[PDB]
Amino acid sequence: IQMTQSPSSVSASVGDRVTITCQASQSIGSVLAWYQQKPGKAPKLLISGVFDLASGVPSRFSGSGSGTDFTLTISSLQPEDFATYYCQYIPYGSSPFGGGTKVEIKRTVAAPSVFIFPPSDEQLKSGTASVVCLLNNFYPREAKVQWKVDNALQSGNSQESVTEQDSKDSTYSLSSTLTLSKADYEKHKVYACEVTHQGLSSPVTKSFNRGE
Amino acid sequence: RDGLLSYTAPVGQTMYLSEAVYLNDSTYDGHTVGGLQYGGLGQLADGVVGLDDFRKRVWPGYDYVGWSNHSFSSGYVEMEFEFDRLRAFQAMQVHCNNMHTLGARLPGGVECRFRRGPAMAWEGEPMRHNLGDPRARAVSVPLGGRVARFLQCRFLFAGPWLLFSEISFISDVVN
Amino acid sequence: QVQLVESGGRVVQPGRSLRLSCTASGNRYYMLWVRQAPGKGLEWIGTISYGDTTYYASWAKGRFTISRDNSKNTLYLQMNSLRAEDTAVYYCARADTGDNGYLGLQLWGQGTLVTVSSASTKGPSVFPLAPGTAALGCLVKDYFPEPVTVSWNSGALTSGVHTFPAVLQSSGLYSLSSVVTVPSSSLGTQTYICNVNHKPSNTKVDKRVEPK
Ligand SMILES: *[C@@H]1O[C@H](CO[C@@H]2O[C@@H](C)[C@@H](O)[C@@H](O)[C@@H]2O)[C@@H](O[C@@H]2O[C@H](CO)[C@@H](O)[C@H](O)[C@H]2NC(C)=O)[C@H](O)[C@H]1NC(C)=O
Ligand SMILES: *[C@@H]1O[C@H](CO)[C@@H](O)[C@H](O)[C@H]1NC(C)=O
Ligand SMILES: [Ca+2]
Ligand code: NA
Ligand SMILES: [Zn+2]
Ligand SMILES: [Zn+2]
Ligand SMILES: [Zn+2]
């Protein structure tokens, strides 16, 4: 009934041997499927049964396992192999899907570029003020963003968005946005955007005061 | 000989145990589209009866056709049969493996659906008929002398695997 | 060439009933329906054993009926009662056995995005972001249906552009952000205008960033 794939992400570089585990809630038969899915695209069948491969799919994709514990070893990681994978027990009828092991490329740590943007004057006419914060070319994805408005931390109304790992430099980008009302904006003065990251010796604080 | 024209049955799956025996219908002349081998004849009507051990120059599992219990949510292998004339069916004898140590056990029950015409739906009123010995026993399935031209026998799962090797019929051509 | 195109892609209100139609160009296989929420993985919805249905799902026990039409060669999926959490891309799977007898879908559908919300189709609001290399961009703050195509300098500037994934705000509208990492020396001499293109509301905003 339940297919618990583990782990949720695998950080590995081109050439590394990568094994993905698929756990089954019950001692099911040898039937299983492995799907490769690159972002913004439809899934692709790689493995049928346990060991059988699909046409076109290279021989580096190896299958193994029986019962509950199942594996997906890769002979040599390739640049066209990075995608989220899904194990699926599929009999003639009731076939549940897996979690999703997102395969991510491994690269040397790069410090983010922090940019704080004050709310535009046109937005301030309607009654809103969304302060944006930009972090670019930072690896890994993990980075804590804090919105210290008027020397105090704000947790409400802070949407965050991370772009999918880049194709040229394999870096991530984050756009945290503190959307606040025009009435509360007048009450406060110094808006800060402090971020913590692996490639930073100390949390970088990028703040702005009221006025050009 | 068995006066059968063609039979519909799901594709033979593979048991991956130790050396991985292939239990596929290698001699099936008909076309296999999707998950069904329909419109043809193969290992289940070749005269050859499977041995006590399915592993025994051919690959292990050549004289058998298999299906796993986990790969069927319905719990039965829906097998259809097509005949040349409107015959009275006395009984169906199927040689299945009963190797309990490797999961290949005899079916728990077999119900058959009958129909006289090719365009009409199945008449109804199915004839349902229900261990330690690990030898392949020729399962006797009484069909009650019912006059029909096409069958739809469902073989229920009792063990983790269902390994049929030969399906034979007992019938007389009705005038 | 075999295709699986479904005629869906409609916004519905919480409680309404939408039906999808997986037409199959190029026909009678073990058919399934698999959905994928934006960001989330894949979860199988149901299956149909050639005209005779087979158990949909633990969650899809109530509602979700998979009808089949052989005269029109199309799978039909009526969703009946709906909740705001049912927004996902709906694909229709075609399960075909491999060379070992085991099942596994080889051909996937195109996918149609279904949005379940009470809000009405609203046009986007583009706001500029005040800028060794400086960063500048646009803010697509208030707009209801997805997606929005943001271009830079009429499709001439691509190096350093990062169009972030749309975040779902508390109001029910999405928020997109597109920024460009340009050098500080280039700021002031070059002109940066983002071509925001929105098809659902028939709107197109060409907003420049800091006119200098
Ligand atoms: C595949 O078979 C297993 C084992 O079930 C056995 O064989 C059946 C035909 C029947 O005789 C059962 O009583 C036998 O136990 C099924 O797995 C079991 O499912 C039951 C469901 O209630 C559960 O309690 C058991 O813990 C499961 N595991 C074992 C080791 O028995 C399995 O469901 C069958 N596959 C399908 C799709 O039905
Ligand atoms: C049966 O399986 C064997 C496995 O080696 C394969 O060579 C053969 O072509 C298969 N035949 C059919 C008809 O599936
Ligand atoms: Ca035989
Ligand atoms: Na079946
Ligand atoms: Zn970048
Ligand atoms: Zn006689
Ligand atoms: Zn193969």
Side-chain angles (χ1 to χ4, degrees):
Chain A
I1 310 171
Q2 291 297 121
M3 310 292 302
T4 53
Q5 216 175 337
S6 284
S8 182
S9 178
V10 172
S11 297
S13 50
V14 175
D16 296 19
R17 195 179 190 94
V18 177
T19 306
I20 296 172
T21 311
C22 175
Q23 313 270 3
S25 172
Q26 297 181 17
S27 56
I28 291 171
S30 40
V31 59
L32 194 65
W34 289 93
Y35 299 95
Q36 181 169 73
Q37 192 188 34
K38 300 196 162 174
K41 295 191 170 188
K44 169 193 173 185
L45 175 87
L46 313 158
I47 289 174
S48 63
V50 159
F51 313 88
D52 196 27
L53 280 155
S55 70
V57 177
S59 53
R60 56 176 173 262
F61 287 90
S62 303
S64 45
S66 186
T68 69
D69 301 355
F70 293 105
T71 43
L72 192 76
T73 309
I74 290 178
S75 173
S76 62
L77 208 54
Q78 292 286 325
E80 60 267 7
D81 283 24
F82 304 107
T84 169
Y85 293 97
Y86 300 91
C87 74
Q88 185 207 15
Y89 147 70
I90 177 180
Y92 294 115
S94 184
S95 56
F97 247 109
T101 295
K102 196 178 197 66
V103 170
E104 174 201 32
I105 198 183
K106 183 179 182 181
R107 201 186 59 91
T108 66
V109 306
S113 308
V114 196
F115 295 94
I116 181 170
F117 303 98
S120 66
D121 296 342
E122 308 105 303
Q123 203 192 143
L124 298 161
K125 292 186 294 103
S126 61
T128 51
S130 313
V131 186
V132 189
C133 201
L134 186 272
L135 308 179
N136 203 3
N137 298 178
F138 66 93
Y139 177 89
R141 176 191 279 251
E142 288 71 32
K144 180 176 293 180
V145 185
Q146 279 142 310
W147 279 109
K148 298 187 68 182
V149 41
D150 212 18
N151 210 13
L153 188 60
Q154 195 97 331
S155 59
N157 300 359
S158 53
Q159 312 273 154
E160 286 181 18
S161 186
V162 183
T163 56
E164 285 297 324
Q165 197 167 39
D166 220 17
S167 306
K168 307 295 177 60
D169 48 18
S170 306
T171 62
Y172 286 88
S173 299
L174 180 51
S175 175
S176 190
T177 303
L178 181 58
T179 171
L180 288 176
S181 66
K182 195 195 176 296
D184 293 27
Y185 193 87
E186 316 302 321
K187 309 159 179 171
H188 315 309
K189 309 169 185 180
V190 186
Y191 307 90
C193 177
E194 62 147 352
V195 289
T196 76
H197 193 263
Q198 192 159 141
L200 295 177
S201 60
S202 62
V204 176
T205 66
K206 286 294 183 64
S207 68
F208 81 95
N209 304 58
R210 305 191 84 192
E212 303 181 22
Chain B
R1 72 163 61 176
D2 301 316
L4 167 87
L5 301 183
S6 66
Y7 64 94
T8 303
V11 189
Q13 306 167 172
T14 301
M15 172 184 291
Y16 308 100
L17 258 61
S18 302
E19 195 188 329
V21 311
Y22 308 91
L23 313 162
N24 63 335
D25 203 341
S26 180
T27 65
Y28 201 74
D29 62 343
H31 208 92
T32 69
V33 182
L36 273 174
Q37 311 192 234
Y38 77 116
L41 291 175
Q43 286 162 20
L44 304 176
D46 62 346
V48 183
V49 184
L51 310 177
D52 274 11
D53 186 41
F54 58 91
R55 294 118 66 190
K56 59 179 187 177
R57 187 170 64 104
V58 284
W59 64 83
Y62 175 67
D63 309 278
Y64 273 92
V65 191
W67 298 276
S68 179
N69 130 122
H70 312 91
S71 187
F72 280 86
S73 67
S74 52
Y76 52 87
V77 179
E78 202 161 331
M79 276 203 64
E80 293 188 349
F81 310 101
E82 177 196 348
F83 300 87
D84 61 345
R85 273 159 293 201
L86 204 62
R87 305 140 156 268
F89 282 90
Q90 282 80 10
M92 174 188 63
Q93 175 205 240
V94 180
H95 202 91
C96 176
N97 203 331
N98 204 22
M99 190 155 293
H100 275 237
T101 188
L102 296 175
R105 300 170 179 172
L106 297 171
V110 184
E111 58 162 357
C112 301
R113 312 206 179 272
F114 316 88
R115 78 171 176 171
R116 295 155 71 180
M120 61 192 66
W122 309 93
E123 157 70 27
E125 292 282 335
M127 295 194 174
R128 168 73 175 272
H129 179 82
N130 276 216
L131 264 302
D133 201 42
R135 297 179 175 88
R137 309 192 68 93
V139 186
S140 53
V141 187
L143 304 172
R146 226 171 173 197
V147 187
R149 208 201 177 191
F150 315 90
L151 307 177
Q152 193 181 29
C153 298
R154 301 172 171 193
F155 303 97
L156 268 84
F157 276 99
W161 277 86
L162 258 177
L163 263 297
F164 299 137
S165 51
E166 182 70 31
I167 300 174
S168 54
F169 291 97
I170 301 142
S171 57
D172 291 321
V173 182
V174 185
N175 297 19
Chain C
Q1 44 191 131
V2 189
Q3 292 168 120
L4 280 173
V5 189
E6 40 269 14
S7 181
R10 194 163 292 110
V11 183
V12 289
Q13 312 283 299
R16 292 256 189 181
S17 68
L18 189 60
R19 81 189 192 103
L20 288 93
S21 64
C22 176
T23 313
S25 306
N27 61 297
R28 289 164 202 162
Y29 291 74
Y30 239 93
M31 292 295 283
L32 309 114
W33 277 89
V34 188
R35 60 172 181 169
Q36 181 163 22
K40 306 292 178 178
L42 289 157
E43 44 181 338
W44 159 86
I45 314 161
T47 179
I48 179 164
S49 59
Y50 322 114
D52 295 327
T53 182
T54 304
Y55 304 105
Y56 312 107
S58 55
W59 67 89
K61 54 165 65 177
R63 81 235 197 264
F64 284 96
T65 308
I66 311 171
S67 176
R68 199 175 189 140
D69 199 1
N70 271 339
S71 68
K72 290 197 169 187
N73 201 18
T74 305
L75 254 193
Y76 289 91
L77 184 36
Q78 177 108 17
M79 301 170 66
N80 285 132
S81 195
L82 283 178
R83 61 203 65 179
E85 304 170 329
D86 283 13
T87 173
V89 183
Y90 292 88
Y91 308 93
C92 52
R94 189 214 64 176
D96 180 36
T97 68
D99 287 326
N100 275 355
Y102 287 110
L103 201 61
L105 51 286
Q106 310 231 350
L107 186 40
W108 274 92
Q110 317 302 320
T112 36
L113 183 60
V114 172
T115 305
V116 191
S117 175
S118 304
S120 304
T121 298
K122 188 193 170 305
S125 305
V126 189
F127 299 112
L129 269 65
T133 74
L136 56 92
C138 307
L139 177 63
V140 188
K141 196 227 188 305
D142 289 332
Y143 74 105
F144 170 66
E146 196 86 69
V148 47
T149 303
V150 180
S151 312
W152 274 106
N153 294 4
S154 276
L157 175 59
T158 51
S159 307
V161 185
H162 289 263
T163 301
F164 287 95
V167 285
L168 187 266
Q169 306 170 126
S170 182
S171 309
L173 313 180
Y174 308 141
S175 184
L176 178 71
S177 181
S178 177
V179 288
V180 191
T181 315
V182 287
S184 185
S185 54
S186 174
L187 178 60
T189 170
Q190 266 203 66
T191 288
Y192 304 109
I193 310 170
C194 72
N195 300 48
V196 174
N197 316 296
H198 197 67
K199 279 83 60 191
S201 80
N202 204 48
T203 47
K204 190 173 294 182
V205 177
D206 289 50
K207 187 68 190 186
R208 57 189 299 109
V209 182
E210 200 184 40
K212 185 75 176 182

